[PDB]
Design a protein around this ligand. Structure first.
Ligand SMILES: CCCCCCCCCC(=O)C/N=C/c1c(COP(=O)(O)O)cnc(C)c1O
Ligand SMILES: CCCCCCCCCC(=O)C/N=C/c1c(COP(=O)(O)O)cnc(C)c1O
Ligand SMILES: [Cl-]
Lengths: 386, 380
C-alpha cells in the first residue's frame, strides 16, 4: 500500500534531517558498538541491581506460581483485597500515606496530573522538569507557567501573579543532575497555598535513610502533597508509582486515562518489586560508594574547567550543537567512554548533552580514566564544551 | 499537608458524584468478590494462556540468568519483531510498552498539527488521545458508517482513517474491505487496531486483516499484546518505513523505559502457542456464537459478532442493579461506564475465553433470561 504524500513527505524529510546529516547515517543517539572493557555510563540502574540473584529468583518463583488471568484495567482491581502489598510497603518506605502502582513513571506523572488538574489550573513547572510532567500538564489543558531552573525567586514572582497552583519539579534532574531546592520550594508552597509535586525518579533508592529518597533525607516528607517515581531507575523495573499524603490515590485509578485504558501490571511483577525494595532498604554500602565516586567525578571534571552543574550521580557534559555533539561523542567513544547523547526533543537543538550516569559498580580506576579522557578531550579535542 | 481548595474541591465533588451515590459507596466498576464457583468473564486473555506451563517456563528461564531510542541498532533490535512481522504479513514490526503507547506513538509519528484523522466514534481511547496529543484534526464518524465517512473525507480532505478491527466494548467488526476501498478512493492512509482479533482470528491467528486478504492494502496495524498474547506490551506494524522513525519521535518510545530483553523471549513462545491454537480458536468462536444467539432471542440488543459481548444497560443506576443481579447469580462481567462510554449508555461487557464451557454458556443465558423477567431493571 502506497503511503499518501502527506505522510511520505514527513518521513522522507525526517530521514534526511535526522539520520542522513550524521557521519554514520544514523540518529545522533546511535554511536559505535561498545566493547567489554569500555566504560559504560548509560544505565539508570544506579545500585547495579538488574542482575541481582535474589530479585531474579523471586520473580521466577512467583511467575511459576501461575496465573490469575488479570489482563484488564487496574480500575477493576481497586477493591482492597485486589490491591498489591507492594503499595502499602512503598508507602511505609517513603513515609507517604498512600501509594498507587502505575505501568511506568511516565504514566504516573500523566495520571496524577490529569486527576488533580482542571483546565484553569496553574502549573508552575521547572523549565527542566521531565517531559512527562510537561506533557501531563498539556494533556490536562492546564495553564503552565515555567520557572527558570531551580530559581525560587522567579517562581515566587510567577505565583504572586497567577495564583495558587501546582509546583512541579524533579528532585534530581534527569539531564544535568542538579538537585532541586526542595526545602525552599516547600516554604513557597506553604506561603502561597500551592501543592507540591516532586518527581524522585533519580533520588529514590540512592538517597535518604534506607534509600527512602531526598524528601526523607531532608525531613520534608510530611510537608509535600505528592511524590512520583519511575521504578525503572534504582528499582530496575518497568513501572512507576504515585504517592499521596491525601486521598488523591483513591481517585486516580478511575480518572487517569493511562490507568483506566492501559493494562495493569501483573501480580507477579508486583511481587518482584517487594524483593527489590528489601534489597534497596539494605543497600547502605552501595549508596555510600556511589555518592563518593560521583563526588570524585564531579570534582575531577570541574577542575578541568568543564561546566558541571551536577550535584549527583548524573553528570552532564554540555556539548552545544549537534555537529559538535557528534564530534565529542565520537571522541569519547573511540576512547573507552560511553555516555548517552541527550538531544532534541529532550533538549533544545543547540544545547545537547552527553550524559554520564554513575552506578555503584563503577570503581576508582574507571573514574580516574574518565577524568583523563575528558582532560584530553578538552586539551586536544577538535571541538568545544559549553 | 491539606490540599489547596482548587484540588480539594474537585476531589470532594468527584467522590460525591462517582463513589457516594452507589449502594456500596464504591466506584460503579467495583462489585462483589467472586467465588470459585462463579463464571468470570472479565479477562482479555482470550485463548486462556496466562498460566500456560510452557510460556511460564520460557520466561522464568530467560529471566533467571533506558530508552529504546538508544536500542535501535540492528544488533539491539529483538527477533520477536521480525517474527511478529512475518506472522502478520506486514513489512516491519516495532515493540512498544503497551497497546496504548503503540497507538499514541504511531499517531505522533505520522500526524502533523492539522492532519485529518477520520476516527470511528467507538475506536479505542488511545487512538482518540494519540490524535489529540498530536493536535491533529479529529473527524469522528458514526460507528461503522461509511456514508458518514465518505462525506467527512469529501469535506475535509485526505487523512488517516482509524478503526478497531473488533471493537472493545460491543464486539462489533469494522467493515474493513469497504474501509480499504474508501482509503484507496480518497488517498487516505488506513490504521487498524487489531487488539481484539490478533490471535483469535485468521490463519494461525494472524488476525482479521489476514483472514480477509487485506494485509497488503493497509498502511498500519497496531495491537495491545495484553489480550490474546497475555503480555503487558504492544506493537506497531508498518507496510512502509515509518517504524524506522517512530523510535525517535514518539514520546512514549523516547521518554519511557524499554521492555527488558527477557520479555521478548516470552513473546516468542507465546506466538508459537498461538500459531498452533486452532483448537482453542474454534471452540471460542463456537461458544461466542452460542451465547449471542441465546441472548439475542431474549430481546437484548446484542450487537456483537465476536467473543466480546456487550449487555447494554443504559444509565448508571440501572447498570448498578443489573451488575448486582448478575453477580448475585454467579455471572461476573466488567462494567464499562464513563469516561469509556457516555453516562447514559453503559455496558456490562462479557469477555469470553477458550476455557469457557457449554454448561457455562447455558448458565449465562439462563441467568440473563431470569434477569429479563425479574422486573428490577431493563436492558437496551
Ligand atoms: C473508570 C472506568 C471506566 C470503565 C472501564 C473501562 C475499561 C477500559 C480498559 C481498556 O480500554 C483496555 N484497552 C486495551 C486496548 C488498547 C491498549 O492496550 P494496552 O495499553 O492495555 O496494552 C488499545 N486498543 C484497544 C482496542 C484496546 O482495547
Ligand atoms: C530522540 C532521542 C532524544 C534524546 C534522548 C532522550 C532520552 C530520555 C530518557 C528518559 O527521559 C527517561 N526518563 C525517565 C523519567 C520518567 C519516566 O519514567 P519511565 O516511564 O521511564 O518509568 C519520569 N521522570 C523522570 C525524572 C525521568 O527521568
Ligand atoms: Cl535513558
Amino acid at each position: 500500500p502506497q503511503l499518501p504524500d502527506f505522510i511520505q513527505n514527513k518521513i522522507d524529510h525526517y530521514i534526511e534531517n535526522y539520520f542522513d546529516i550524521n557521519k554514520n547515517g544514523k540518529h545522533l543517539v546511535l554511536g559505535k558498538q561498545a566493547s567489554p572493557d569500555d566504560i559504560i555510563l548509560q544505565s539508570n540502574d544506579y545500585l547495579a541491581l538488574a542482575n541481582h540473584p535474589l530479585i531474579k529468583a523471586r520473580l521466577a518463583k512467583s511467575l511459576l506460581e501461575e496465573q490469575q488471568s488479570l489482563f484488564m484495567s487496574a480500575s477493576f482491581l481497586q477493591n482492597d483485597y485486589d490491591k498489591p502489598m507492594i503499595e502499602k510497603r512503598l508507602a511505609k518506605f517513603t513515609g507517604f500515606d498512600e501509594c498507587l502502582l502505575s505501568q511506568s513513571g511516565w504514566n504516573a506523572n500523566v495520571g496524577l496530573l490529569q486527576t488533580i488538574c482542571q483546565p484553569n489550573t496553574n502549573v508552575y513547572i521547572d523549565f527542566f522538569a521531565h517531559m512527562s510532567l510537561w506533557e501531563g500538564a498539556r494533556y490536562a489543558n492546564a495553564q503552565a507557567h515555567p520557572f527558570m531552573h531551580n530559581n525560587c525567586d522567579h517562581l515566587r514572582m510567577l505565583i504572586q501573579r497567577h495564583g495558587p497552583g501546582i509546583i512541579v519539579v524533579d528532585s534530581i534532574y534527569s539531564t544535568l543532575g542538579t538537585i532541586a531546592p526542595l526545602a525552599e520550594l516547600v516554604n513557597i508552597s506553604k506561603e502561597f497555598g500551592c501543592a507540591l509535586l516532586v518527581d524522585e525518579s533519580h533520588s529514590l533508592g540512592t538517597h535518604g535513610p534506607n534509600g527512602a529518597g531526598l524528601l526523607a533525607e531532608l525531613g520534608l516528607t510530611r510537608e509535600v502533597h505528592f511524590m512520583t517515581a519511575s521504578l525503572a531507575k534504582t528499582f530496575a523495573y518497568r513501572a512507576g508509582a504515585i504517592w499521596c499524603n491525601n486521598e488523591v490515590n483513591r481517585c486516580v485509578p478511575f480518572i487517569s486515562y493511562p490507568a483506566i485504558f492501559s493494562s495493569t501490571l501483573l501480580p507477579y511483577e508486583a511481587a518482584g518489586l517487594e524483593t527489590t525494595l528489601e534489597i534497596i532498604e539494605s543497600a547502605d554500602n552501595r549508596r555510600q560508594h556511589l555518592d563518593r565516586m560521583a563526588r570524585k567525578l564531579r570534582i575531577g571534571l570541574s577542575q578541568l574547567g568543564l561546566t558541571i552543574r551536577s550535584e549527583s550521580q548524573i553528570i552532564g557534559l554540555e556539548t552545544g550543537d549537534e555537529r559538535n555533539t557528534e564530534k565529542v561523542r565520537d571522541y569519547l567513544e573511540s576512547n573507552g567512554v560511553f555516555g548517552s547523547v541527550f538531544c532534541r526533543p529532550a533538549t533544545s537543538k543547540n544545547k545537547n548533552i552527553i550524559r554520564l550516569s554513575l552506578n555503584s559498580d563503577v570503581n576508582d580506576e574507571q573514574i580516574a580514566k574518565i577524568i583523563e579522557v575528558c582532560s584530553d578531550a578538552v586539551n586536544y579535542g577538535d571541538f568545544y564544551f559549553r
